Design a protein around this ligand. Sequence first.
Ligand SMILES: NC(=O)c1ccc[n+]([C@@H]2O[C@H](COP(=O)(O)O)[C@@H](O)[C@H]2O)c1
Ligand SMILES: NC(=O)c1ccc[n+]([C@@H]2O[C@H](COP(=O)(O)O)[C@@H](O)[C@H]2O)c1
Lengths: 486, 486
Amino acid sequence: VQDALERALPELQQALSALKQAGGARAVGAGLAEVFQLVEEAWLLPAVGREVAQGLCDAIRLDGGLDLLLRLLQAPELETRVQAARLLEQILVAENRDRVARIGLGVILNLAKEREPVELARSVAGILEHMFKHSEETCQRLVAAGGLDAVLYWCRRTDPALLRHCALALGNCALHGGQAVQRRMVEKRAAEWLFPLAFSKEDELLRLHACLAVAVLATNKEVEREVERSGTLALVEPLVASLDPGRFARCLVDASDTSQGRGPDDLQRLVPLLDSNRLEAQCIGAFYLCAEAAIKSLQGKTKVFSDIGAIQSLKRLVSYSTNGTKSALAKRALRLLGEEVPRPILPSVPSWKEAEVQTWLQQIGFSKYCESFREQQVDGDLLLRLTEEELQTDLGMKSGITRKRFFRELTELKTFANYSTCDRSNLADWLGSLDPRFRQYTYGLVSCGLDRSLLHRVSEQQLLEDCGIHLGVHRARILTAAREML
Amino acid sequence: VQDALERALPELQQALSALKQAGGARAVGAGLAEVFQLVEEAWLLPAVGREVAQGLCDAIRLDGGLDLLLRLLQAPELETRVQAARLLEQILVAENRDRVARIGLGVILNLAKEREPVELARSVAGILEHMFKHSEETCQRLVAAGGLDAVLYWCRRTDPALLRHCALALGNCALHGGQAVQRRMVEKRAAEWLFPLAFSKEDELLRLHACLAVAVLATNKEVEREVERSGTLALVEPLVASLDPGRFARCLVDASDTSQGRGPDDLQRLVPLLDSNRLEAQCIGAFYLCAEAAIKSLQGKTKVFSDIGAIQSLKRLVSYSTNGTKSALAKRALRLLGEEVPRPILPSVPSWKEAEVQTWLQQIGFSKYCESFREQQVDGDLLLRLTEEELQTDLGMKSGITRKRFFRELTELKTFANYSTCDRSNLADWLGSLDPRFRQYTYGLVSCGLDRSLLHRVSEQQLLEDCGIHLGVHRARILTAAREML
Ligand SMILES: NC(=O)c1ccc[n+]([C@@H]2O[C@H](COP(=O)(O)O)[C@@H](O)[C@H]2O)c1
Ligand SMILES: NC(=O)c1ccc[n+]([C@@H]2O[C@H](COP(=O)(O)O)[C@@H](O)[C@H]2O)c1
């Protein structure tokens, strides 16, 4: 409904005109307070708050509002500077951020150099946290300047809002920033600086943000060991298992800085954490996704989770996981969205009998082919070695699209299977080290007698014909990794 | 209707004969005024104006009119010179344009060196603006002479007509002139001289012309950064969102110099702006096309927009855009033409389910194949990897022409899709940097595991068989770009 937007925009235009007509500090402050009140009311509006606040932010984007606020932020009087930053913190949506990045970068960097004032420090922390979510080159230039060191410095204060903003900034730059940024931060010692925040006990939100930042940093293998040595990473898993997503979701809605929740593009960034191969990362990602699902289901906008790929990852995590806390979090999140909860698939595929194959077929939605699979007595050994011709002629999958879907399911089963009963040289982990999506080839190599001590003598033709590696890219990568003597 | 033409020609011939019989300044001026009054009466004629004035121009082209006017323009007396230039400004249609370029170029260049007179300067500005629309070699020779410097020099005056003519000339040379001319102008500092014109407030038409010129200059990436640093470019988008195309279209019709609008070849040059990849360029192009549509629909000549490819571009811009001002302008322009407005297509193709595919199929006009697609359960993942054989055998597109049409649609969907859920190494932007028509290949590479850090080791056979790049030209270009270490 745009009725709130239609009502609010006249008032916003009048306030902007008055601010443009403000020739002194008093009028400037009055106009800034008026516009801040107008935008805050929209940000706290139930259900339609985001759209009817992005509308006013877009309006301010036009009419020269952003440039006027920046110029006021350059004003000699700090009393106006603080209010200008206060308003600039609550408007930096993507459309209002790209302009600031093109124009307003640098001036804010220099302004951040005043590390003494508390209100200015808080507002500037807001600006930086909301700015680190721009393209990775913006992160490069921000870290090159004193922004990263500045937030590093503010980390040692006590007022809660500044610490929470610093933690949010650290998480945002850990996520959006590139691998170089994360390595740079680790060399900056930023991982160790978060330990007091995570171990603190004043607020649970600050601890959650610190754990998120440290986990996202730890996902990167290049610096995983030193990050773990900080000791804060081990504090992640115990924290999530105790907190309740509903209570954590009940919060973030009584507050104003997050009353409306998390956007579609900030949820896209968290989804990969469910695929991070790191237990703490998956746990914290599942916790955050559960909280955001709790918020959005109340907002009645759960469709976003489908467009992001979160439901698929949650179902896969439920199926192919052995831990308890992350499985429970994923199951609760799936139930919140009103989606089904897959039953766990026992991982020892090579030791599967007919019944297991029938159950798996019924799970993946190929129940039309249960009779054909049962007639031919396809078991785990015969399933892991199935081919296109055997699918087409013997099992009866004539349509090539259906066969592609079946192989798409079987590749996920292969990647997330357990080959302990087959490979005694632990060849699955070596393949997973290069790229996790190479773990599907374990059974291909193992059944041919290959081991870690025989790989360096293999050839591309043997991999193509005997081990059944079809894609040339994977063949070349495996050969290059093997010819370096494992 | 040629009745106006048939009436007008006898008078034009009598006036031309009288001018040829003019032996002094007074008779020359009288004949020039008569012919000027005649051509102007035709130019301001509703609906048929353009044709019945082009006929008078062809009449003048023959009978030695153009050579006579040029010789008068060489007359020692400036009183006759100004009128000769005044009449030469209003007759330079393409047929009358090429002749002057072959013959009358150079003399006009020298005459332009009279920077002091106001009337002569105005007429020369008109001549130069209407001449810069000749082949790019004519632009090269004009810039080599003092024409570009002369117009930049007149840009610093105040009389409105001269400034408007200079802005129009600069826009015309930016559009018709080659990339070398644009680079030359940027090095000439031509971008910066436009800032006062765009920031002016006396007339909105001058600001619009300056914004058009600067945007067309900025489309060229080689000089985009320095052009943006001028500061005028950022003033483009705020301007269009406030002006009304109808009022702007209502103007340019009360004026004689544009009473008839823009021609079929001056619109073909604006249409490429909708594909410029620059937000300001697309916004200004959409605004201009909307204004011209408003004019031509009143003239009842909207067919031209189909012959130019403007409707296809407008529909594509409406479908695959996220901005508000340009989308609104495109929708209004489409509605003026009496054409349909496509509903937006959500860009996250990889995350599509069956319903999204059915909607897309119904949009593109392949609703006859909805049942076949639904039966085979084609979704975004299977849609982005569809082939000729699967289309033919499994889905049932027997006619090769229909399959070519379908792939024509799918390639546009692929280029304008959002692969954020797939590519964490942001490989789409690298492909789009070489040529935007390569962004279609993103999902082809990504699904094979390739990244920016693995491209330099790929081979042509891998790009052909695995990544599915059929055209050899694109394969060679991609390999050459990758082997230079990204
Ligand atoms: N994301 C929210 O729930 C929320 C709530 C209230 C205000 N805001 C403001 O919105 C801006 C950030 O917008 P997005 O992060 O949604 O792009 C900031 O100025 C912030 O202060 C966001
Ligand atoms: N394009 C118009 O709407 C228009 C209107 C009146 C006169 N003219 C004259 O026609 C000539 C340009 O012709 P075209 O723009 O059709 O190529 C110039 O001499 C100009 O003064 C053009």
